[PDB]
């Protein structure tokens, strides 16, 4: 059976650095954990799979190779993405009183 479709909206959690470093400690230690290199497939997979399971938002294949460091992973996960359609994006943008937008789709 098809579960409810996963909403693509994603808001980075406030304690994102703390959660990320906890996961990094779980997977891999040294100072400046931001600069830990993810060159190892095992470690990269463990970290990214844990993060995806926890936050409900995975690194796409397109960006996957760019995650050279935990700093890159943090950058990817601290940028929000909204799944609202253009209809919402326009209507909920403080339309002036003389502008009316209707959608028949």
């Amino acid at each position: 059976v098809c579960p409810p479709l996963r909403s693509r909206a994603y808001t980075p959690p406030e304690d994102l650095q703390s959660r990320l470093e906890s996961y990094v400690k779980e997977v891999f230690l040294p100072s400046n954990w931001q600069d830990i290199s993810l060159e190892d497939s095992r470690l990269k997979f463990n970290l990214l799979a844990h993060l995806a399971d926890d936050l409900g938002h995975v690194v796409p294949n397109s960006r996957l190779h760019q995650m050279c460091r935990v700093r890159d992973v943090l950058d990817f996960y601290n940028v929000p993405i909204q799944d609202r359609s253009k209809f919402d994006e326009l209507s909920a943008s403080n339309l002036p009183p003389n502008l009316k937008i209707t959608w028949s789709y």
């Binding site: 209809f87 003389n98 502008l99 009316k100 209707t102 959608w103 028949s104 789709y105």
Partner: peptide, 8 residues
């Protein structure tokens, strides 16, 4: 000017 956008 009243502006309407129909999207259809």
């Amino acid at each position: 000017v009243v502006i309407y956008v129909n999207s259809r």
